[PDB]
Design a protein around this ligand. Sequence first.
Ligand SMILES: CC(C)CCC[C@@H](C)[C@H]1CC[C@H]2[C@@H]3CC=C4C[C@@H](OC(=O)CCC(=O)O)CC[C@]4(C)[C@H]3CC[C@]12C
Ligand SMILES: CC(C)CCC[C@@H](C)[C@H]1CC[C@H]2[C@@H]3CC=C4C[C@@H](OC(=O)CCC(=O)O)CC[C@]4(C)[C@H]3CC[C@]12C
Ligand SMILES: CC(C)CCC[C@@H](C)[C@H]1CC[C@H]2[C@@H]3CC=C4C[C@@H](OC(=O)CCC(=O)O)CC[C@]4(C)[C@H]3CC[C@]12C
Ligand SMILES: CC(C)CCC[C@@H](C)[C@H]1CC[C@H]2[C@@H]3CC=C4C[C@@H](OC(=O)CCC(=O)O)CC[C@]4(C)[C@H]3CC[C@]12C
Ligand SMILES: CC(C)CCC[C@@H](C)[C@H]1CC[C@H]2[C@@H]3CC=C4C[C@@H](OC(=O)CCC(=O)O)CC[C@]4(C)[C@H]3CC[C@]12C
Ligand SMILES: Nc1ccc(Oc2c(F)c(F)c(C(F)(F)F)c(F)c2F)c(O)c1
Ligand SMILES: [Ca+2]
Ligand SMILES: [Ca+2]
Ligand SMILES: [K+]
Ligand SMILES: [Mg+2]
Lengths: 159, 490, 160, 160
Amino acid sequence: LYLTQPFACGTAFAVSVLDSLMSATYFNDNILTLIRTLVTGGATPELEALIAEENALRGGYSTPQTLANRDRCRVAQLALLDGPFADLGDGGCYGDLFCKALKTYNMLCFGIYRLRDAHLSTPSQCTKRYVITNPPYEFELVPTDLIFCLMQFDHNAGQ
Amino acid sequence: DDAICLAELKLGFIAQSCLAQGLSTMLANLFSMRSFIKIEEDTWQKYYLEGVSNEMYTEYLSSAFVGLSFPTVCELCFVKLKLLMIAIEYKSANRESRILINPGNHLKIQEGTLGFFIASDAKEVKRAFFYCKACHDDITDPKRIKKVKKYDSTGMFHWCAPKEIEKVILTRSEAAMTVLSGHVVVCIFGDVSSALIGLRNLVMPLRASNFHYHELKHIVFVGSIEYLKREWETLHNFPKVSILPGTPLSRADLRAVNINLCDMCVILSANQNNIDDTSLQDKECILASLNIKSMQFDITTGVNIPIITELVNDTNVQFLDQDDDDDPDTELYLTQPFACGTAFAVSVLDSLMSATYFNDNILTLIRTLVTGGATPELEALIAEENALRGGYSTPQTLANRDRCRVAQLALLDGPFADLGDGGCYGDLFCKALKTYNMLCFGIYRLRDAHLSTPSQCTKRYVITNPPYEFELVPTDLIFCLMQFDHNAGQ
Amino acid sequence: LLYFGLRFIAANDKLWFWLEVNSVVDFFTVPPVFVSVYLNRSWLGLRFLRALRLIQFSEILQFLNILKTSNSIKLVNLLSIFISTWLTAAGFIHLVENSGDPWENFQNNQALTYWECVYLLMVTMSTVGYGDVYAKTTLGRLFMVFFILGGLAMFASYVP
Amino acid sequence: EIIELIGNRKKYGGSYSAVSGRKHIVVCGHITLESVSNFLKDFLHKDRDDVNVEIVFLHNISPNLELEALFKRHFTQVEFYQGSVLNPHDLARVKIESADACLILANKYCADPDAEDASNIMRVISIKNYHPKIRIITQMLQYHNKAHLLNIPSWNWKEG
Ligand SMILES: CC(C)CCC[C@@H](C)[C@H]1CC[C@H]2[C@@H]3CC=C4C[C@@H](OC(=O)CCC(=O)O)CC[C@]4(C)[C@H]3CC[C@]12C
Ligand SMILES: CC(C)CCC[C@@H](C)[C@H]1CC[C@H]2[C@@H]3CC=C4C[C@@H](OC(=O)CCC(=O)O)CC[C@]4(C)[C@H]3CC[C@]12C
Ligand SMILES: CC(C)CCC[C@@H](C)[C@H]1CC[C@H]2[C@@H]3CC=C4C[C@@H](OC(=O)CCC(=O)O)CC[C@]4(C)[C@H]3CC[C@]12C
Ligand SMILES: CC(C)CCC[C@@H](C)[C@H]1CC[C@H]2[C@@H]3CC=C4C[C@@H](OC(=O)CCC(=O)O)CC[C@]4(C)[C@H]3CC[C@]12C
Ligand SMILES: CC(C)CCC[C@@H](C)[C@H]1CC[C@H]2[C@@H]3CC=C4C[C@@H](OC(=O)CCC(=O)O)CC[C@]4(C)[C@H]3CC[C@]12C
Ligand SMILES: Nc1ccc(Oc2c(F)c(F)c(C(F)(F)F)c(F)c2F)c(O)c1
Ligand SMILES: [Ca+2]
Ligand SMILES: [Ca+2]
Ligand SMILES: [K+]
Ligand SMILES: [Mg+2]
């Protein structure tokens, strides 16, 4: 299943690929909390204690110590077509992009979601893309690329 | 011609355990025929197995006890013959059994007064019939002795004007303001289209007339409201009854009612027979019981909360405790949760069939100690109306309140504090009769009292009818039968 | 002998490894060869037990990752067990009949060949039972009586 | 009938023997060919650092021929014992006192999700009742059933 095109493009999902988590959590102690924090949007001990009592959620009043829990990196995608990273779209050095983003915006790039037919000489109109996880330092980039990122919460906003 | 109702007796045993913990496991051990087992290593089994050796028999009294009062006869029997005489039946135009008798009120009518005894076997009981005063005075050893409407219509239960169900229903926020202490909380897992257990048999013993009004315990039900209204028709005449809709598995509900300030917390299930899987039976009861043990309070832990739970498959008794040494071969009567009085299965009442045949008066001695005192006249009224009709107060009705009740004593302070460390159970028993006319018939002793190493567990077990020279530690409780006091400060 | 040493080391409980069929056949097969070499003699003793080594084939084929499916595993098991026990019984009959009776001073010796003994065991297992060849010594008859109890049922069950 | 009555015996009865300086784990629950093959293929992969923990299965149904062949292929690092996890005798047989962890597999493709969760809850309760300090890793099918595990007296999520 892991080699099929629908799975390699992120348009399909089956629960049978989660069976490997049994052996993954045994060898490394804190993986299950890392996944749940990354995926369920918060798995802090405060929620764990509260969810045991009421098995629900209650509204509250905002306090300066409460509003300090709103600083968590979120998952987002970026495009090299336009912006500060447009210069590196044609350039093609993945390492340079990684360092520049982390130093400036404290943004962590850990993947490329590349167009399927970007490596073919003949032109095409297919818009399907697949995932490349943790490419090496010397990786060529193309302007039609999307990079996975983790972005810091910013208290101010245009709104 | 006896009919042994299992549900009535089971619920009566549980309700009696509500007043004094361990009473169900003490009473269920008086009807199983067992022999003395002696072990060498110093564990709690050593005393528990000595306790469980006793059974309850009955036999007539010799002519040496004709013109004597019941306390004097009981003290004489204990001290001399090493027998515990719990109750007698008073021969008359119609038979009637008295549980415990104050002096002067009842002298032995001599008309073949049948006494009830607790002893190892019938051979020892036979001494009471052959006792000759002149011949056997010198013989010290037990051996060598040879030839507004407030009460019920019958005036035996508390009563009140009928109340509709909506006037007693509470909510989680509402229950917080009410302050409940020393109450009884009942957890039921029933629902619509399920077998109907008779909840009248559980609260009726708790509403007996021999208790004063302020001594009554508040009762709170935690379960599906749909199931409760199916039998509220038989419950709306009792005072101080409340309902909290919800689920006993929810830790939030168990905090609304002060579950850490209770006397008991009964756990019952109604759809236990419907399940076909052997393992999945008792899933609710076992899981709910473990939930309370893990709760945290600012008594600081849920382990010390007193809980009793019934089981449909007694092999699941191993899951009720963590520090026990589980074994799938030991019988239910010997495992720790049963010995501590925190479990009860209906399979222990199978022994009541054979006990009834050999002496029919046993089934009527019990069922009045256990049930609040239901009489055949009252059962006729419930058959037709099924509403427990109340009535007015007359001197004949108010004279039925005077009957003994089951209570649990404490040696930490009071008149008996001195004997807490001396260690002569016989001295306490003799003093109790001649002073307050209460009958002591057991010890509820800490599980780790004999060990030298200090511990923190507060579990206790039952010792039934200890010998005369038994040693007493200050940290233990005494089972007693207390006389009703007509007047008492409020 | 060396292969027996390796199996002994890898065993968990030495007592229950010792009380095993392969260990027993090794015990009853290997030492007599050295004894014969030392004595410069020979004896056709319990050599027929060498046919009991055919049972290990179905397990060593699984070790070699050759057999993987249930039908093939069952077929190989049945074939190996049937052939091995048939040949072992034939060998025992051959030895007992050709040798004689020890308490008779070896005077009941009936001349038989291994092929004839195989034929006799096949006819006995099939429950056909001609009168052309049969056991005539006391030990042979006793073993035939005890083998009739089990071999007949085995033949009735395995072949279909 | 006699032949059938004799030989009715469990070939996988026995007790595990601990080895000094080597950990082991116990696997129970939904044991089948595909599940065991996937679990072993992921557990014994070469990308992991060198590991020497033994895997001890425990199921109450005797394995079939091809599952037995799989266990033969993983001969020196996998063991099987027949029993029930709701039995203290079996739990003591598999030497669960010194086991590093206990893994419980679930049946994802089950007809009724609730019964599987209830069975897993029973298994966890039994294991923690026998030994309240072992580490347990389990699979849950429904979220509202996972809250019940938070009420077991000895279930510590801060520990693993
Ligand atoms: C499966 C294992 C335990 C081997 C068992 C073999 C025994 C059943 C056999 C092997 C040697 C036999 C013995 C070999 C020779 C003799 C001498 C024989 O007496 C003779 O001198 C023979 C001629 C005569 O009877 O005068 C009596 C039987 C006896 C003891 C035999 C009895 C049966 C024995 C002990
Ligand atoms: C347990 C299994 C593996 C082997 C069983 C072998 C038995 C069937 C053998 C072993 C000892 C034998 C006995 C050994 C010696 C004798 C004495 C022998 O008689 C004589 O030696 C002289 C008198 C006569 O001629 O009968 C008659 C047979 C008999 C009883 C044998 C009968 C067959 C026996 C019981
Ligand atoms: C059950 C199926 C697989 C058939 C089994 C066939 C056996 C009964 C055959 C296969 C090999 C045969 C043997 C092959 C060679 C010889 C040697 C032969 O003798 C000689 O060659 C030397 C001279 C002599 O002594 O006659 C006598 C027959 C014999 C023992 C044969 C006897 C019958 C055997 C064991
Ligand atoms: C495919 C498998 C089953 C092997 C097939 C071949 C064997 C079954 C053959 C090969 C050599 C044959 C043997 C060759 C010679 C003899 C001697 C013969 O005895 C004689 O002296 C002749 C007796 C007669 O002709 O009646 C008995 C059969 C036998 C053992 C034969 C039996 C059958 C054998 C073992
Ligand atoms: C199942 C175990 C207990 C073995 C049962 C048999 C044995 C106890 C032995 C002991 C003495 C033997 C007997 C000793 C002598 C004879 C006479 C003998 O008469 C003959 O004509 C001899 C034939 C022959 O052996 O060649 C027949 C066998 C028989 C009854 C033997 C049969 C087998 C016997 C009973
Ligand atoms: N050439 C020869 C010499 C002695 C023999 O005596 C045995 C015997 F009497 C016996 F009972 C067995 C048994 F244990 F297997 F049964 C044997 F194996 C024997 F060897 C024999 O059979 C043949
Ligand atoms: Ca007795
Ligand atoms: Ca236990
Ligand atoms: K024939
Ligand atoms: Mg091994």
